[PDB]
Symmetry: C4
Subunit: 97 residues, 4 copies
Amino acid sequence: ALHWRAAGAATVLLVIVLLAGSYLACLAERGAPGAQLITYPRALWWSVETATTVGYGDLYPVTLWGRLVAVVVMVAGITSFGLVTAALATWFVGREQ
Amino acid sequence: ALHWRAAGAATVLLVIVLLAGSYLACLAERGAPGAQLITYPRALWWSVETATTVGYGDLYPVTLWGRLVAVVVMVAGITSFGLVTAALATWFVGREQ
Amino acid sequence: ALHWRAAGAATVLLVIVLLAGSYLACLAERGAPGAQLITYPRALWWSVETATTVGYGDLYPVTLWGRLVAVVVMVAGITSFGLVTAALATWFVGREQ
Amino acid sequence: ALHWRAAGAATVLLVIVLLAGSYLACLAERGAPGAQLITYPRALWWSVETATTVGYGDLYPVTLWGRLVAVVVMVAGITSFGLVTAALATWFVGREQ
Ligand SMILES: CCCC[N+](CCCC)(CCCC)CCCC
Ligand SMILES: *SCC1=CC(C)(C)N(O)C1(C)C
Ligand SMILES: *SCC1=CC(C)(C)N(O)C1(C)C
Ligand SMILES: [K+]
Ligand SMILES: [K+]
């Protein structure tokens, strides 16, 4: 099908928005007052939290560019998440017939 | 359509909303013990991180007014998002035929 | 209707819960090494951010009771809102005709 | 039913989940530069704000493992919730008849 195969495949987009932005923000925040982001595994952690729209605060991109990227990496894991929730609704109705 | 173009539109809608709170927040907070909520280009990243419902904490309006606005600015990001979810939802439904 | 007036009514309940936990958590966090969670108008601002599950971190309860109210409110946030997402979901179907 | 019992059921299962990661977490991050993740009862309040998607910032583990775990924990919260959303949407839709 789709709603079942598509949702399963767009999470695999999520890794992309996570691994990408990590190794992207981090070379925008490499040289500067940038928080503990100047690190790649640091960033990888950030995006992870960010992905879940958590927002601990422990870290965050300060660089104008790192900042934008963020915006991207969070949309990623909400856009990505609303999908699961949408497959979920269609699946619940599939048997409601 | 609607459930597809009405969400296309509410997204484009919200963006302006973010800008609103931004220069509404920040005239509210730009004259007091307020935090970085004084400069325009900050509130931007503020309204952004606020809408997505992350809440690092790095910045956070103090004034009562800057505060309502926020309350407004959050709801925007949630409602705006809940649409895209509903849009996704039915578009999965529209493959039940 | 329902999905359209049960949501329009359940926000009222969510609004009530804020006003509830606010003047509730506050006497739980009154006396004792607790953040500004002592004032009445202080918690109110935390509810808005709590209900929507923002998590600035600027304010939060630490007393086993103070904490209980929190969890009770946030579940109200996330709840009161999944409704308006599901009001929106079905309204996007009611024009499948 | 299903969409009503399945979600009733995933909530109870989710509640049990948080506990798992909590004593699973607190053991990963109980003996190092770790914050307040050493105490069992703390982690409870950690997972709980965590699985909700809040992210106050007052605490946060950093042990690679306690961390990986967390990523597991958020997913629980959102997933668990996305259910309640699909069920609410279907229950509100099954009233069109
Ligand atoms: C399970 C808590 C729900 C958290 N949400 C969605 C999680 C997405 C990772 C955050 C809104 C992000 C648009 C919904 C806000 C609840 C008011
Ligand atoms: S938000 C208040 C404000 C005044 C002015 C000097 C015009 N700005 O640039 C901002 C938007 C900060
Ligand atoms: S979480 C590690 C831990 C060990 C023990 C003493 C059994 N605990 O009560 C906790 C959970 C704190
Ligand atoms: K959130
Ligand atoms: K959050």
